[PDB]
Amino acid sequence: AKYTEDQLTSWTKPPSDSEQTKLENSEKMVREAISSDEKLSKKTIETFGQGSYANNTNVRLNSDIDINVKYSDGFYFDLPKDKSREDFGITLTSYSYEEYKDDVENALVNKFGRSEVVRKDKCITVKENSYRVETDVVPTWDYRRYSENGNYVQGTKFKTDKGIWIDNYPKQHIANGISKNNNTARRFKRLTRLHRKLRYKMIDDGGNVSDNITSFLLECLVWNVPNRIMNDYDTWTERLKQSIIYLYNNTREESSCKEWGEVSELLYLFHGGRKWTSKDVNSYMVLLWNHLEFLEH
């Protein structure tokens, strides 16, 4: 094996002892930028971490914290095709997502200064300093997806500056990750961190990792590793090996994994709209396997 049991074990750990303190300080400073703003303070706006700090799966020291500022005085929605938006109840508003993202930028600029705040395609960044971690603020709106039977699931929706509309379910992602971690004696998030770290390590020493393989994708893949692979093997060498075998075997043909969801279980991994394919995943598993140099016969 290229890495010892001690090395793999150490890469299952958070990269600092104060991950939660960093997340909470970013959340609070953004929440304050919002409540100090005359315009936005009058609206229902919830500030919450999403992303790898909120899921306690970050592995890069002082990497960006992802902070959602979700406005919920109106919600976008989607209905099944045999239901009428009229009969559901339509609300018209002169407010818009575009104005909202500008407003959030203004509030950030007022709290932190124009030089510290950078508008980007999908977020607004607050630059790090000695006291704060670099923070990506994602303004979103409330979102409801209704199913056939009349139930709905609630998430977030936003629009990139290039005009792409994107739905997410950060709360169900967080809750589900916590469930699987509870059912695996906390090995699910340790295995996630280990896989994420191995990816960065292969990239750093020159490996041919496809741009299509992201840290988010790796968490979704480990999510789809059944709990017994975490629970029934006794070392990290073996849990990692078995997880790779499972993911390789089940991406050799697209029919084996076409139903896999992301952690929220409310979006698919391989139903379009993604920059990866299951073939990409399979080839990454081959690369990782060959990189780890497990002893053969």
Numbering used by the authors: 2 to 298
Cite, word for word, the article reporting this structure.
The native structure of ClCdnE was refined to 2.2-Å resolution. Like other CD-NTases, the ClCdnE protein folds into two distinct domains. The NTase domain contains a central β-sheet composed of five strands: βA–βE. The longest strand, βE in the middle, extends into a flanking β-sheet with strand βB’ on one side and βF and βG on the other. There are two helices, α2, and α3, in this domain. The helical domain consisted of six major helices, including the first helix, α1. In type-I enzymes such as cGAS, the NTase and helical domains are connected by the “spine” helix, which is broken into two upon activation. The separation of helices α1 and α2, which correspond to the “spine” in cGAS by a short loop in ClCdnE, may account for its constitutive NTase activity as a type II enzyme. ClCdnE was most similar to EfCdnE, with 44% identity. Despite the differences in local regions, the dispositions of the NTase and helical domains were similar in the native structures of ClCdnE, EfCdnE, and LpCdnE, respectively.
Here, we determine the high-resolution structures of cyclic di-pyrimidine-synthesizing cGAS/DncV-like nucleotidyltransferases (CD-NTases) in clade E (CdnE) in its apo, substrate-, and intermediate-bound states. CD-NTases share an N-terminal core domain with templated and non-templated polymerases of the nucleotidyltransferase (NTase) superfamily, but the C-terminal helical domain shows a higher degree of variation. Three conserved acidic residues in the central β-sheet of the NTase domain coordinate with two metal ions (A and B) that are essential for catalysis. Based on sequence conservation and structural similarity, it is proposed that the cyclic di-pyrimidine-synthesizing CdnE proteins, including ClCdnE, EfCdnE, and LpCdnE, form smaller donor pockets that act as molecular gauges to recognize and retain the binding of pyrimidine nucleotides but weaken or exclude the binding to purine nucleotides.
